Structure formats: C-alpha cells, structure tokens
Amino acid sequence: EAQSIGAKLALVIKSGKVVLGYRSTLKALRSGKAKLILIAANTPPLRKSELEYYSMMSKTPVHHYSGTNIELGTACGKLFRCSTMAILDAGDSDILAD
Amino acid sequence: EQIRQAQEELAKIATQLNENPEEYPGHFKALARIGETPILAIQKLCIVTQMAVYKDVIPGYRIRPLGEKEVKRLRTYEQALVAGYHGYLKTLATYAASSIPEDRKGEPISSIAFTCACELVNAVPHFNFRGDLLRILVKKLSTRKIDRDFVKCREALEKLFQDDEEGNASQEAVSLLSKMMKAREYRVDESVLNLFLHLRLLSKWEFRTKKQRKLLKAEKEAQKVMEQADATVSHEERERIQSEILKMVFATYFRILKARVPHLMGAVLEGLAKYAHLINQDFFGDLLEALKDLIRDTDRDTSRESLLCTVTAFALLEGQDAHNARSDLHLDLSFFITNLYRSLLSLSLNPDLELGNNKINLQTTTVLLLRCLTSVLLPPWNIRSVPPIRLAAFCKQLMTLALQVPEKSSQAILGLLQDVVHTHGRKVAALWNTEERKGDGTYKPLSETVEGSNPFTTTIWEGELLRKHYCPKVREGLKAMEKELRSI
Amino acid sequence: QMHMTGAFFRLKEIDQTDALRRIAKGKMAMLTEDGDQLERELDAMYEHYKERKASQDAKYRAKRARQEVDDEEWEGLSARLEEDSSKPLIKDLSSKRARGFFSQDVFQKIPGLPNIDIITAEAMTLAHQLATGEKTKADLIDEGYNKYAFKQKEGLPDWFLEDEAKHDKPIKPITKEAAQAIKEKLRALNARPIKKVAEARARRKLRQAKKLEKLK
Amino acid sequence: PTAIYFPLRFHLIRSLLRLSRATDTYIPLASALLEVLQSAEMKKPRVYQDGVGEQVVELLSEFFVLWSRNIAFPEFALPTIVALKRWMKEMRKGNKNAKLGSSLVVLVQKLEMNAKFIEER
Amino acid sequence: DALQNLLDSIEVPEGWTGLTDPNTGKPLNLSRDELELIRKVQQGLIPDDV
RNA sequence: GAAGCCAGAGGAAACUCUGGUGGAGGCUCGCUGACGUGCAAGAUCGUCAAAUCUGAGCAUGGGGGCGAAAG
Secondary structure, three states, X not given: OHHHHHHHHHXXXXXXXXXXXXXXXXXXXXXXXXXXXXXXXXXXHHHHHHHHHHHXXXXXXXXXXXXXXXXXXXXXXXXXXXXEEEEEEOOOOOOOOO | OHHHHHHHHHHHHHHHHHHOOOOXXXXXXXXXXXXXXXXXXXXXXXXXXXXXXXXXXXOOOOOOOOOOOHXXXXXXXXXXHHHHHHHHHHHHHHXXXXXXXXXXXXXXXXXXXXXXXXXXXXXXXXXXXXXXXXXHHHHHXXXXXXXXXXXHXXXXXXXXXXXXXXXXXXXXXXXXXXXXXXXXXXXXXXXXXXXXXXXXXXXXXXXXOHHHXXXXXXXXXXXXXXXXXXXXXXXXXXXXXXXXXXXXXHHXXXXXXXXXXXXXXXXXXXXXXXXOOOOOOHHHHHHHHHHHHHHHHHOOOHHXXXXXXXXXXXXXXXXXXXXXXXXXOOOOOHHHHHXXXXXXXXXXXXXXXXXXXXXXXXXXXXXXXXXXXXXXXXXXXXXXXXXXXXXXXXXXXXXXXXXXXXXXXXXHHHXXXXXXXXXXXXXXXXXOOOOOOOOOOOOOOOOOOOHHHOHHHOOOOHHHHHOOXXXXXXXXXXXXXXXXXHOO | OOOOOOXXXXXXXXXXXXXXXXXXXXXXXXXXXXXXXXXXXXXXXXXXXXXXXXXXXXXXXXXXXXXXXXXXXXXXXXXXXXXXXXXXOEOOOOOHHHHHHOOOHHHHHOOOOOOOOOOOHHHHHHHHHHHOOOOOHHHHHHOOOOOOOOOOOOOOOHHHHHHHHHHOOOOOOOOHHHHHHHHHXXXXXXXXXXXXXXXXXXXXXXXXXXXXXXXX | OOHHHHHHHHHHHHHHHHHHHXXXXXXXXXXHHHHHHOOHHXXXXXXXXXXXXXXXXXXXXXXXXXXOOOOOHHHHHHHHHHHHHHHHHHHHOOXXXXXXXHHHHHHHHHHHHHHHHHHOO | XXXXXXXXXXXXXXXXXXXXXXXXXOEEEOOHHHHHHHHHHHHOOOOOOO
C-alpha cells in the first residue's frame, strides 16, 4: 500500500527521531541504535550493498522503498532528494510493529 | 488443499525465472511436470502460467540448434527454453482440439488455450515455432462456425497483419490460409478472406579512457557501414516478400473466381480492386478482360454477379495511377458502360433489388447499381468532359426504371438524377424542354448501343406519373429535381 | 520535475534461513580408422573458410543478420570453502508471493478458475530442343553417355564436390529464346507496376531536361 | 413467395388495383405481378396452370387500362412488353400452353398498339 | 479461359516452355516423363536406369 | 533584441503589464531559368542550380540509348 506507507512515514518524520541522507544513515548504523533503514530504488548498487552489509552486522531491519529519491523526499514532507534514511525512534506510529 | 499447493509452486517457478533466468534451467521442464494433474483446475492455471513465463523469458532473436563457463551456462538455459516452448505449443494444440461442451461455471480449457494462443501470436512471432502457433489458429478458422473462439482467432491474425513490417510472419500466415482454403474447397466464412485486406506490406559527461574512446570510434564506423547495407537488404527483402504474398493472395482470388462461389467472390473483387495496382502492368489489362468474361458468363442472383464485376471495373480505373495509364494501357470501359445500359430494362422487372466502409462488397443490388451509375455519370476525373449524349441516354432510362421499382429504390434514383442536373446543367436541360427537342431522327428505346438510341429526340414525361406516386419522398424528389431544372 | 525527466552482496535471498545464521556467526572461510574424426575437422575449417570469405562483403553480413532459422533445422525433439575449526531483516510494510503473482491482470480476467523446376537457362535450352522436333528421346539418352557421366557424388566431401562444380560446368551454348523464357518465368509479381514504370519514365524525361539546361 | 400462397397474391393485388382506380395514386405492380408469372410452375410443363394463367391475363389488363390516357404510357409500359417478348422466345424454344401463349400474344399486341396510338397525340 | 491464363501467369506450370505447338495453337508443355529426362541429362548422376 | 532570471502590480490559476538583467539568431549594414502537378478554358502548389576563403598533400566521377533495377 503506497498511500498507507507514506502515512506512517509522514508521521514518524513529524513525531519520531529520523536522520536523512547517506552519511547520517551510516553513522546511525554504526551506533547501533537505528531501528529501520529505508533505501530508495535508484540508489547506486555499491551504495545499496554496503548499506545492506552494515544492517546485517548491526541487526537492524531494512526496507527497499519502491519509489525513487525524489519520491521518498516528497513522502517525507521535505523538498530535497533523499536516497537513504534511518529511523531512530518510531514516535507515535506503527511503522516498527509491522 | 491440493489446488492450493500448486499456486505457491506455480509462483515458485515463475518468480525466479523473472529475477535470474539462467541460474535455473530445469524450471521450464518443471513447469511441464506440474501440468498433468488429472484434476481440472491446475490444468487451467498452469496453461496461463506457462503463457506468463514465456512472454517474459523469450528473447527478441531466434536461437540455432547446437548441432556439433558462462557460454555453457547460456547454452543450457537457451536450449531448455526451446524444449519447454515446443512442449507448451503441443499441449496448447491438443487442448484447443479438445471437446468444447462442459460445465457452465467456466469455459473448460479451449478458450483459455485459444486466448493463450492469440496472446502469443502478437507477442512471440519472431521466435521459433510460429508455424505451430499459427496452425492452431488456421485450424479453428477452417471450422465453418460462428463462435467466440472463432471470433477470437480472427482479430489475432489481423493484428499480426497490421503490425508486421518485416513480412516473414505475414508470409507464413497467408501461406497457411491459402492452403486451407483450397483444402476446404473454399467453404470459408469470408471473414478469413477479408484477412488479406488487412495486410500491411501490400498497403552529463561520462568519463571514457583512451582505449574506450578508440573502440567507440571504430564501432561507429562499423555501424555506419552496416547501416547502408541493412537499408539496401531490408528494401530488397521487402519487395521479395511482397512478391510471394501477392502470388499466393492473387492465386486464391482467381481460384475463387473460377469455382464461382457466390458469397466469396464479392470479397474477392474488393481485394482485387484494392491490390491490382501493386501487381505488374501487363496484368492490369488481363484483369479488365477477365471481368468481361465473367459478365458474359452470367449473361448466358445473376443480376448481382454482373453488377459486382461492373463496379469492380470502374473501381480499377477509379485509382489514380490506373487513370493516368488509360492511353498507354488500352483500358476501355465501353463494354461495361454498354452492358449496364442494356440491362436497365431487365433490372426494373426483377424484384429482389433491396435485401438487407467498403466499396465493392455491398449487399443490396440497388446500391451496386447506384455506385455503377455514380461512376458512369459523375466520375471524379473529367466530370466536365463527359459526353452529353451518354448523360442523356441514362437520364431517360433511369427515369423509366424509377417508375417500376420499389419505393426506396425510386427515391434513390431521383436523388441520383438530382445530382446530374446540378453538376451538368445545360447538357441535359433540353430533355425536359420539348421545344428544344431534336428532329434529326426518332428515339430508339430498345437499342444495343448508347450512341444509337438518339436520346435528344425524346422528352421526359415520367414526372407526371411520379408526382402522383404513393410515397411522398418520391414526390419530394421530383419537386427538388424540377427545382434545379428551373434554376438553370 | 526536472529530476524525473560479480554481483554484489544482497540480503534478499539470504533472509530467514540457516544461511543467514551461519554467515552472521562470522567465522573465517576462504574459497579454494575410417577417417571419421579427421573428416569432422576438415569440414569444420571448410565451413569456417566459406563463412569468412563470404563475410568480406557488407551485403552478406546484413542478409545473414536478417535471415531467420528453419524449423526444418530444429527438428528432432518431438516432430570448496576452507573453513575455520572454531524474524526477517527485509520487511515489507504491509503466501504473499502467491497472492502477488495471481493478483496479476491475466489471472483476473479469466473466470471460473518430386517437382522439377527449370531455373537455369541451359536446362531451358535442352527443353526447347526436346519439346520441338529437333532432339528426340533417343538423342538425349545417347548423348548423356559422355565424360561427365558415371561420376559419383554420393559420399564425397563438400570441399571436394564444390571445387568440381565451380570448374566442371560443361560448355554448351544457350539460345536467346531460352534465356528470355527464364527471365519471364522468374520475374516477380511486383517487378513492373504502373507506379514504378511511371516514375522511371519521369526520371528519364527529367534527365534529358538537365542536359538541355547544361547545353544552354 | 411461391405457388402455394398464389391465391393470397391475387386478392391482395386486386385490393391495390381497387385503391389505384378510386384515388389518383400510382401503385407499382409491374415487378410483383410479373414475378408471380415467372415462377417455376409456369415454366415447368395443368388446369390450375391454365387457371393461374388466365387469371393473371386479367391482372395485366386493368393495371394498364387505368393510366392508359396519361402521356407517360410509352415509357411506363415499355419494361413490360420487352419482358413478355423474351417469354415468347422461351416458349418458341417449357410448357405446352398454346392457349395461354396466344392470350399473351394479343396482350402485347394491345400494349404496343396503345403505345403507338398515343404517340401521335 | 482468361482466369486460366491469368493463373498460369502467376503460378507457372511445371512443364512450361514458352513455345507454341505447331499442331494446336495452345502453349506447348513438357510432360512429366520429359521433365525427368531433362533432370537426368543436366545432373548426369545416372545416364540410364536398370 | 531572443529564450531564461530578478523586483513590483492585477488575476483562484494559467497568464497580463511595467522596470531592470541577459546576449540565442539560415537577420541586416560597409563596396532569375529548367521541370513537375494540373482532370480547366490555365489557376493553385512542389523539386532542381547559383554551395566560408586560403597554403601544403590526396582520392574518385564523367558519352548515348534500352530496361522496372540489376545490368
């Protein structure tokens, strides 16, 4: 459900604790406190595979977002391209229970 | 359930063939083993699933037989694709040949087998065994029935004809249709004869190293040389395929005209008038003379055959290229004009003149007569250089025929003579004026020539009998026609 | 809006299996007489020689690429890791594969789940002689006992036979009426239509007009 | 069509003939009446074929005597006489109805004469 | 027939020659036995049977 | 002076007007003939030639007619 998956994404941005972008996603994985990792479809494969490797080592779930980077940024309420993002706190949304 | 556990195992095979096909070469044959379940349901979902995978997997190029690490991986996967697709077409054909009546909950196997065939025909054709795909379609199109699968097999073939540009797919289809029609001895539904009318052949800086730059230069010159060679070969191949299709199409046309199949030969003359300008120049006068021989044979129902060949001859000279070759190719339509004139008295007597976007294959005799007179009296070319005596000859006879003809036919003829007065005017105005009547000779009604009737020595009086005809559209027809007589 | 206008490591086919549990353990590993056979190769180089020589022309490379294969050719089918001695990760925010595949469009519309052909002009010449009262049946049979007779061609290799056929064509004359019959037999059905004859005459008339312009 | 429902034609034909005599309206019977004549039974070779033959001689008659004073009669009648002129040619070459053949001969001698006699007026 | 002549123009007969028979003005055609003899002489594989 | 950009005023919008920035162009400045189409008693449309200057090196093309081109 594309409409519903943007609903908790818009809530977790506006209620929870989220970092956006490649480098901040990397630092959140390194600290081990990340709880969900969203990766855009048009992310380059070397960036894609390095991010899948660290999430396996840090044991955090991943999600392959169907839309591209501009689509994920629009889902965030932001006006910039966001290829990768990480959830640190789910806030008041059911995006972590699912 | 039993039917449940197939659905994941159907989805098991198809999904990984979509992701990485070469990794798994027995899955085509694995799709075969899950297909002989005697329970009828999984026979249905497998046939659709085999249609699903081969649409996604089949490449855009044919693959040769092997004869005789990554190369051995590609060869095993590609040879497994052929053996799977050969087996699917066999199980498609024996499923379409199966018995049609079954439970009313759904159509049993056959229409699914046909809809799988028609989907493959417009998605596969380049790949091998297209003759096996088409032989399923031609077998249903020979059945001589109106049925949904008969209809479904029909738009599949004209979709193939309208879209194929290379011509190899069209040649194999028209070869089977031609061989079916002779084998059936021409008992086809004449929807498949109109399939020939649908043929189309007849009608931002990326860095590059120094070695990459030189390889891309040499690839450009190699592609440049290969471009003029491909253009010349594709043009020469297209003319050759058109030559073979035109031979098989016209041979079927002439064998129908010899066998005298009534419903088929209406469609043949439509195809003949459409495609005669593609064939050789010498054969154009032959077609105009074979039509003469047909008309003489009916002169030995029979009113429809003569009018069909008459409107076809006028439709041949209708065309632009044939019109400019009247002087060179000695194409005289004087036979068809004179035979049309001599049959107008007999045509009024025969009572089957009205029986309920083409040009020749019209159903009713009256509109065939109307299109013949439109060609004679209102031609698209040289409408002002028409012999007025020929105009006056038909004007009197069409007035006579309107007296003894059905109500709709009489209204149509008065509409036709209405157009002659508006277009020609002073040429035929003297017919209704009895003081301008010529005194050179007397009027011969029963004449065997258009020129010898002396039409300007008579006067038209059928308007007296037709302002009194029971249909007021006939009455309105005169009052419109006499309106333009006074408007000259 | 202007934005819209040897494989790597993946976690897709390793999720929820014992392989993930094994890899996540992180223990080290590394990857550690009758001449039949002589006749097979001699025909292989001869085919390779023929395809190489014929591919020097750009026309043949275009013809071969557009050439199809024959179903008469495809017949025959029916008709170590050196190891050391010591809830999914991918979540779809929603079997699902079986539900997804059969939610496709195609599954939803379906409810209730010997001929002798004279091509060469020389065979036409022999046909014109035989059909007319010029050469009888006795003369054709008797003159077939010549030096090109009783020569076998059955088991002979293709490189031997193709060399002979290039260099053993008998030299007997043809007639112009035999050659005329062959071209009119082999003429295509769209070779000479009204359209192409018209532009050919128009091209020739224009060519004379430019010559008169140049002489002007 | 056809011969089984032949008496249904003739009474129906007379009803149209009655209407055309009272009001001044043209009703074309020439196609229909000749078609009933040129069915299979007349051309296949007995009392009933004379009865249907003598009767249809009448229905040819009053159809032409209605508008026998209107000027367009050389052209109105002309398709009909030429139709029977072919019919005299086939019987000279069907049945053996010499009495029926002779009655139509007088009928086309009538129609030609009234066509001729009206051309001078 | 004109339809017959127009079929021979498209699908040429097997024994077709392009000549006119002196005896009958119809086009002169080779027989099946004659076509076999022409093949035997041209290829020269077997001069005579048995 | 073109797109494009900045600022202000109308209009729900698209757009409109003004003031600027910008510096695209088959734009300008210095000292017509041969044909084709024509469906009339010739109208109307299309094709062809007139093709950046210059040193040093270099390659190829030319006549007629027949034929649909290949020849």
